[PDB]
């Protein structure tokens, strides 16, 4: 009776087939026909998987060779002129937009901007519009949503096409360089007819419903934008188009409820995983006949769903609007979860019992739907209940030492021993750095020997002492190089690290890792996030050995290098049974031990980077957001406040000055008015010349005092350019030292 629904399925393939074939295509190893054949294979496999699982509402158009939002831009002719000048077929225009284009003498067409999709770890290609943009359907390039619907239909699988809706599509885009005064939303009248035509075509092909995504409804929207949903949907809905299910996820639509209370659409979908508390209010506005899709299986995390609790949420929706009008759904697309738990070859059976990946989530929505339908699934419910009980009663989750340590967090634990003014004095006495001190921010070009030796070491073919000796040689090389250039504060190059999250996660209690838990991050770049399964602590030193060796071969101060607690949290799959805050503070305490060990070992300049802070900002202004900024900065300060005044804490940023200031780092490298009343120091970041450098500093000298300025590159190119560049930077910095 009650139907089940999936908002989208990850398209990468259980064996990363999509990556392999698209990268072969781009490198010229595979033909476009081979590319298209593999896409067809993947789509068919994924449709039949969903059909076999018993899912009622199965998506189409969720597939992509690169990005769904980019697919729409191609479909609607939101294609900037510069991409159209190379005689490229539409699929190659698509790829040109997504990943740029190089050509012989000399073309260097840059890809469109990559943008985080809300607070997920996915990135979309920014829709880019000009005054001259002529929205239209390009039939010769084929009409993807229509072709894919027909494709699935021919396999005996009826699907629901998924398209990003017109308000979100425009609102999430930006004005192109030539049209700086253009407001994207202003283009609504031009794009609606094109949506209308596409929907007509989908109807004619046999599509009876369409999932139309309007996730901007979970954002703070100006009143003027809110009015556009009525405008848009009155224009789209009619007898000649499929029924529309207006779909939201990742947040709370309540602030925008009036915007959608009088729409002619056939139904809505809401995310009751992220915001179950919005159920009553959103249900209350449903018109006669409109349906409510209850998102109760998480599309962004990997924990087995509690069937009893999820069913109860669905039952509340039923109580409000009727069993005939409720659908059991994934909370969002499954794009953000790995493909298949069954591919894992190493996880203990106890832990695996706690997880569900995309393939398993198909079974979950089906069982939940059957349960609320009155069908006997007592066996599935008992087994699920057993697994939930098992995880709950585990010990790998609960560490008494960690819990006790959490109670010790207080203001003093989150505060340096003295304010920056007093610290600076001790730091000057210890380091006596010159004005305009020079440093770098990250890694260097690693040799191929490093990868080969790492591989041999992992197989025992070389001994730890051999590998360690190769690592140190790489460190020695990097260090000597910097000394010759005359940099003031050095780094070791991190040759021993493969990733800035897993390198730490592997050395922390409370984490689990997958062999195949891949999730698409952007284009063909995938990530395999660590999973936080329980209370986190750090048994022993994680980075000290290599930093100590690096410092032992130079008299210049050597930077220790760490990733901060919030970034480790944001780039992992978090626990769902304890708050993000608590996990971050546990991480802060674990990292505090590492900072302390580095200091104790003589590494007294330490860089701790938090590149994921902005990405985890709660989607709306308010209590959740301000609390987040507070505990994110608190967790950083917990990691970094155990040190002496003479010990120097750095942090790099690629932002809200107020939050930066809240970290109280001694030095922060960034890529300024508010920083005028701020003591702590700042490092301001094609081949640059000494004079080209001299101009930049002179300008900034008009604002910030010379006494607060470090000199470094923008962020972490080849060896010849890295040499001259750095040599140019330092020679330049020295030139400003002469004037003092
Ligand atoms: Zn950067």
Beta-strand relationship, 174-175 and 128-129: parallel
> Is 700 a known ligand-binding residue?
no
Residue of 271, 267, 286, 143 whose CA lies nearest to 209: 267
Domain interval for residue 463: 394-514+530-740
CA angle 629, 635, 641 (to 5 degrees): 125
Do 523 and 462 fall within a single domain? no
The Cα–Cα gap between 706 and 739 comes to 11
Structure tokens at 477: 């090389």
Do 611 and 581 fall within a single domain? yes
> Is 719 a known ligand-binding residue?
no
> Is 715 a known ligand-binding residue?
yes
DSSP string, 206-235: T--EEEEE-GGGGS---HHHHTHHHHHHHH
Do 581 and 663 fall within a single domain? yes
How many whole angstroms from 307 Cα to the centroid of ligand 1? Answer: 43
CATH number, residue 496: 3.20.20.210
Q: Which residues contact 77 (CB under 8 A, 6 or more apart)?
A: 133, 134, 135, 136, 137, 138
Query: Quick check: 585 and 414 in contact, CB under 8 A?
Result: no
How many whole angstroms from 728 Cα to the centroid of ligand 1? Answer: 20
The alpha carbon torsion through 65, 70, 75, 76 (nearest 10 deg) reads 180
The Cα–Cα gap between 37 and 60 comes to 17
Structure tokens at 25: 């295509």
The Cα–Cα gap between 423 and 49 comes to 61
Alpha helix segments (H runs only) across 227-357: 228-236, 257-260, 279-284, 307-321, 349-352
CA end-to-end span of the chain, whole Å? 81
DSSP string, 601-654: TT--EEEEE-TTTGGGS-SSSSHHHHHHHHHHHHHHHHHHSSS-TTSEEEEE--
Burial 595-625 (b: 16+ CB within 10 A, else e): bbbbbebebbbbbbbbbbbeebbbbbeeeee
> Is 671 a known ligand-binding residue?
yes
The Cα–Cα gap between 58 and 334 comes to 12
Query: Quick check: 109 and 117 in contact, CB under 8 A?
Result: no
Query: Quick check: 7 and 57 in contact, CB under 8 A?
Result: no
The Cα–Cα gap between 85 and 100 comes to 13
How many whole angstroms from 500 Cα to the centroid of ligand 1? Answer: 14
Choose one of 501, 529, 557: the last residue of a domain. 529
The alpha carbon torsion through 38, 39, 45, 48 (nearest 10 deg) reads -140
Residue of 630, 672, 669, 675 whose CA lies nearest to 651: 669
Structure tokens at 294: 């209850």
Do 521 and 590 fall within a single domain? no
Do 305 and 398 fall within a single domain? no
Structure tokens at 29: 């190893």
How many whole angstroms from 442 Cα to the centroid of ligand 1? Answer: 9
Query: Quick check: 733 and 438 in contact, CB under 8 A?
Result: yes
Do 548 and 420 fall within a single domain? yes
Distance of CA 323 to the CA centre of its chain: 36
Query: Quick check: 188 and 170 in contact, CB under 8 A?
Result: yes
Do 471 and 378 fall within a single domain? no
Q: Which residues contact 133 (CB under 8 A, 6 or more apart)?
A: 77, 78, 187, 190
The Cα–Cα gap between 605 and 558 comes to 7
> Is 262 a known ligand-binding residue?
no
The Cα–Cα gap between 318 and 296 comes to 13
> Is 687 a known ligand-binding residue?
no
Do 683 and 612 fall within a single domain? yes
Residue of 647, 549, 636, 638 whose CA lies nearest to 605: 647
Choose one of 473, 506, 529: the last residue of a domain. 529
* Structural element, H or E, at residue 47: helix 32-53
DSSP string, 656-713: -HHHHHHH--SEEEE--GGGGG--SEEEE-----HHHHHHHHHHHTTTS-GGGEEE--
Do 183 and 307 fall within a single domain? yes
> Is 19 a known ligand-binding residue?
yes
How many whole angstroms from 550 Cα to the centroid of ligand 1? Answer: 23
How many whole angstroms from 652 Cα to the centroid of ligand 1? Answer: 7
Query: Quick check: 325 and 290 in contact, CB under 8 A?
Result: yes
Do 417 and 291 fall within a single domain? no
Do 266 and 413 fall within a single domain? no
The Cα–Cα gap between 563 and 639 comes to 10
Q: Is the dihedral of CA 301, 307, 308, 314 positive or negative?
A: positive
Query: Residue 691: phi, psi to the nearest 5?
Result: -70, -40
Extended strands (E) in 29-88 = 59-60
As for how many domains the chain has, the answer is 2
* Structural element, H or E, at residue 489: none
Gyration radius of the chain over CA positions: 27
The Cα–Cα gap between 46 and 40 comes to 10
Structure tokens at 188: 């609504």
* Structural element, H or E, at residue 694: helix 690-700
Eight-class DSSP state of 276: G
How many whole angstroms from 708 Cα to the centroid of ligand 1? Answer: 20
Do 438 and 356 fall within a single domain? no
Choose one of 529, 560, 594: the last residue of a domain. 529
How many whole angstroms from 613 Cα to the centroid of ligand 1? Answer: 13
> Is 571 a known ligand-binding residue?
yes
Alpha helix segments (H runs only) across 409-564: 420-431, 448-458, 464-485, 502-505, 544-552
The Cα–Cα gap between 700 and 721 comes to 25
Q: For residue 424, give Cα distances in angstroms to 297, 600, 680, 708.
A: 52, 20, 8, 10
């Amino acid at each position: 009776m009650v139907q089940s629904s999936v908002l989208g399925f990850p398209r990468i393939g259980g064996q990363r087939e999509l990556k392999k074939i698209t990268e072969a295509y781009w490198s010229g190893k595979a033909t476009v026909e081979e590319l298209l054949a593999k896409g067809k294979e993947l789509r068919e496999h994924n449709w039949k998987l969903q059909q076999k699982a018993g899912v009622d509402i199965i998506p189409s158009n969720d597939f992509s060779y690169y990005d769904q939002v980019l697919d729409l831009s191609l479909l609607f002719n939101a294609i900037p002129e510069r991409y159209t000048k190379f005689d490229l077929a539409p699929i190659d225009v698509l790829f040109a937009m997504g990943r740029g284009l190089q050509a012989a003498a000399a073309v260097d067409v840059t890809a469109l901007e990559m943008v985080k999709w809300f607070d997920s770890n996915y990135h979309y290609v920014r829709p880019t519009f000009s005054h001259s943009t002529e929205f239209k359907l390009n039939t010769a390039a084929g009409i993807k949503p229509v072709d894919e619907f027909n494709e699935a239909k021919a396999l005996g699988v009826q699907t629901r096409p998924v398209i990003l809706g017109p308000v979100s599509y425009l609102y999430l885009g930006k004005a192109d360089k030539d049209s700086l005064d253009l407001e994207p939303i202003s283009l609504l009248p031009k794009i609606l007819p094109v949506y209308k035509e596409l929907l007509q075509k989908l109807k004619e092909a046999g599509a009876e419903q369409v999932q139309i995504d309007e996730p901007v409804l979970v954002l703070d929207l100006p009143e003027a934008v809110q009015s556009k949903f009525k405008e848009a949907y009155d224009a789209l809905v009619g007898a000649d188009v499929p029924e529309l299910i207006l779909t939201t996820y990742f947040g709370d639509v309540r602030p925008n409820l009036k915007a959608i209370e009088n729409l002619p659409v056939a139904g809505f979908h809401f995310d009751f995983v992220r915001v179950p508390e919005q159920l009553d209010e959103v249900a209350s506005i449903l018109k006669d006949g409109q349906t409510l899709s209850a998102g109760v299986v998480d599309g962004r995390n990997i924990w087995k769903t509690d069937f009893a609790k999820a069913s109860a949420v669905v039952q509340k929706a039923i109580e409000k609007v009727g069993k005939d009008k409720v659908v059991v759904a994934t909370s969002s697309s499954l794009l953000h979860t790995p493909v298949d738990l069954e591919s894992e070859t190493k996880l203990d059976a106890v832990i695996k019992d706690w997880f569900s990946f995309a393939t398993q989530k198909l079974d979950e929505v089906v069982v939940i739907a059957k349960n609320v339908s009155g069908e006997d699934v007592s066996k599935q419910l008992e087994a699920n209940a057993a697994s939930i009980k098992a995880r709950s009663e585990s010990s790998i989750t609960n560490d008494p030492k960690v819990q006790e340590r959490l109670t010790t967090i207080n203001e003093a634990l989150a505060t340096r021993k003295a304010a920056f003014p007093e610290r600076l004095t001790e730091q000057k006495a210890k380091y006596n750095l010159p004005l305009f001190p020079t440093t770098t921010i990250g890694s260097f070009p690693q040799t191929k020997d490093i990868r080969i030796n790492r591989n041999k070491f992992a197989k025992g073919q070389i001994t730890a002492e051999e590998y360690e000796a190769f690592i140190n040689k790489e460190i020695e090389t990097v260090v000597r190089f910097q000394e010759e250039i005359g940099l003031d504060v050095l780094v070791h190059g991190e040759p021993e690290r493969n990733d800035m999250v897993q390198y730490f996660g592997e050395q922390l209690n409370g984490f689990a890792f997958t062999t195949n838990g891949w999730v698409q991050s952007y284009g063909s770049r995938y990530v395999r996030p660590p999973i936080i399964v329980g209370d986190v602590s750090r048994p022993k030193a994680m980075t000290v050995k290599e930093s100590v060796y690096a410092q032992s071969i130079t008299s210049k101060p050597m930077k220790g290098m760490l990733t901060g607690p919030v970034t480790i949290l944001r780039w992992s799959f978090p626990r769902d049974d304890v708050s993000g805050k608590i996990q971050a503070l546990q991480l802060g305490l674990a990292l505090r031990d590492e900072v302390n060990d580095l200091e104790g070992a003589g590494i007294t300049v330490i860089q701790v980077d938090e590149p994921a802070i902005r990405e985890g900002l709660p989607l709306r202004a308010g209590k959740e957001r301000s609390d987040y900024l507070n505990w994110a900065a608190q967790s950083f300060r917990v990691a970094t406040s155990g040190v002496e005044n003479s010990t120097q804490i750095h942090s790099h940023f690629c932002l809200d000055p107020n939050h930066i200031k809240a970290l109280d780092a001694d030095v922060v490298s960034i890529e300024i008015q508010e920083f005028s009343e701020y003591p702590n120091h700042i490092g301001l970041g094609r081949i640059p010349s000494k004079q080209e450098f001299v101009s930049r500093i002179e300008e900034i000298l008009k604002v910030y005092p010379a006494s607060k300025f470090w000199v470094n590159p923008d962020c972490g190119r080849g060896w010849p350019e890295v040499k001259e560049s750095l040599t140019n930077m330092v020679e330049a910095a020295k030139e400003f030292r002469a004037k003092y």
